[PDB]
Design a protein around this ligand. Structure first.
Ligand SMILES: *[C@@]1(O[C@H]2[C@H](O)[C@@H](O)[C@H](O[C@H]3[C@H](O)[C@@H](O)[C@H](O[C@H]4[C@H](O)[C@H](O)[C@@H](O)O[C@@H]4CO)O[C@@H]3CO)O[C@@H]2CO)O[C@H](CO)[C@@H](O)[C@H](O)[C@H]1O
Ligand SMILES: OC[C@H]1O[C@@H](O[C@H]2[C@H](O)[C@H](O)[C@@H](O)O[C@@H]2CO)[C@H](O)[C@@H](O)[C@@H]1O
Ligand SMILES: [Mg+2]
Ligand SMILES: [Mg+2]
Ligand code: NA
Ligand code: NA
Length: 330
């Protein structure tokens, strides 16, 4: 079955930066694999680039992609972050900085309980301290939940607008891992998820004129029945998988790659939007990019690390792998 990927992103009149980023992904897809690393946001300034910095010093190159999260930008009790000058622009500045170096900012958002009754993003089926926030109500005009999500969306849009006005484009991966139902946005199932995606997509793209985003839909794990969760080809640019293999297992995850090609009819670039152990670079399973999670998921610890020093040295020197030093500059 053929690939059938659009040369333009879904956003009408994408920014110059977004079209360059999207074209870079299209032209490298199936030929090279873009290296990435997640970072941990919060009150630790020093630590904001620790994973890319470790990779530079130990493996000889920074990843081409850096991950950042708006999780503290809104939420009950998070004023220490979103009202502090040291932290209220941490995500924008991190994204700006990496873009200016020629890298790819990949943004997500562990979206805390929009009601502000709790500070939680985890759902009642997660096994963790949960929010009761009801996505089915959030997608209905005129409910308290709807008002709450629109307030939070305005705050995040303000940040993304700062990026837009600076010429920065990003991978934007909202409402992620919905199918696991462990976050409130997926907890009510596919119907509310798709309606939330549309509310956000329309608000960002149409109402706020945010033309600088490349939209990443996270298709699993779990992948079963994901077709019913898909927002549609007109609101997604990239299919991302979040696959956490056994610790130390660098299997290529070929079967998940093939499933994303089949399920989405070859219409979208396929990426490993989160992982623990990184899939071995392999053009038979050519993830557009990979992104291990932060801390020990990237920087090795112990005798069976997720990504050992020797694995990283090999991976970041491979001709298959794009590092920050291979980027053209935007
Ligand atoms: C404030 O408290 C911070 C706390 O210091 C900080 O460690 C903290 O970070 C948590 C975060 O709340 C949580 O969402 C995140 O969840 C992870 C998850 O565990 C997993 O790794 C994966 O799913 O990703 C999730 C998202 O990253 O885990 C991190 C810990 O790694 O959150 C609280 C606030 O909510 O600290 C500041 C600065 O010191 C003080 O000023 C505040 O008063 C204090 O409340
Ligand atoms: O622009 C040069 C050629 O690009 C071809 O598509 C590429 C794509 O950009 C990626 O590199 C990857 O998917 O490989 C394909 C195949 O080379 C395109 O199909 C050609 O028409 C075009 O001349
Ligand atoms: Mg549709
Ligand atoms: Mg091989
Ligand atoms: Na699965
Ligand atoms: Na090691």
């Amino acid at each position: 079955q053929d690939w059938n990927i659009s040369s333009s992103p879904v956003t009408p009149s994408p920014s110059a930066g977004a079209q360059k980023l999207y074209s870079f992904l299209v032209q490298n897809f199936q030929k090279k694999i873009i290296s990435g690393a997640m970072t941990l946001q919060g009150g630790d300034e020093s630590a904001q680039t620790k994973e890319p910095d470790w990779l530079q010093q130990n493996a000889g190159h920074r990843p081409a992609l850096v991950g950042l999260d708006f999780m503290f930008q809104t939420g009950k009790g998070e004023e220490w972050y979103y009202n502090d000058s040291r932290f209220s622009k941490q995500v924008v500045n991190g994204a700006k900085s990496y873009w200016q170096k020629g890298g790819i900012p990949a943004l997500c958002w562990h979206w805390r309980d929009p009601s502000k009754d709790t500070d939680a993003f985890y759902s009642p089926s997660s096994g963790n301290s949960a929010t009761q926030f009801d996505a089915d109500q959030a997608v209905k005009s005129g409910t308290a939940e709807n008002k709450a999500i629109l307030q939070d969306l305005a705050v995040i849009a303000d940040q993304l607008q700062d990026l837009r006005d600076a010429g920065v484009a990003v991978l934007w991966r909202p409402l992620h891992e919905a199918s696991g139902k462990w976050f409130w946005w997926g907890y009510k199932g596919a119907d509310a998820l798709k309606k939330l995606w549309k509310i956000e997509f329309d608000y960002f793209v149409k109402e706020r004129n945010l033309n600088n985003l490349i939209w990443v839909f996270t298709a699993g794990t779990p992948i079963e029945g994901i077709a019913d969760w898909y927002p549609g080809d007109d609101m997604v640019d990239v299919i991302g998988m979040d696959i956490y293999a056994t610790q130390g297992d660098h299997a290529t995850q070929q079967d998940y790659f093939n499933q994303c090609k089949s399920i989405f009819k070859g219409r979208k670039i396929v990426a490993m939007s989160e992982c623990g152990s990184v899939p071995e670079p392999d053009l038979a399973a050519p993830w557009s990019f990979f992104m291990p999670w932060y801390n020990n998921y990237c920087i090795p610890e112990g005798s069976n690390p997720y990504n050992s020093l020797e694995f990283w040295k090999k991976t970041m020197s491979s001709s298959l792998v794009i590092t920050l030093d291979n980027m053209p500059g935007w």
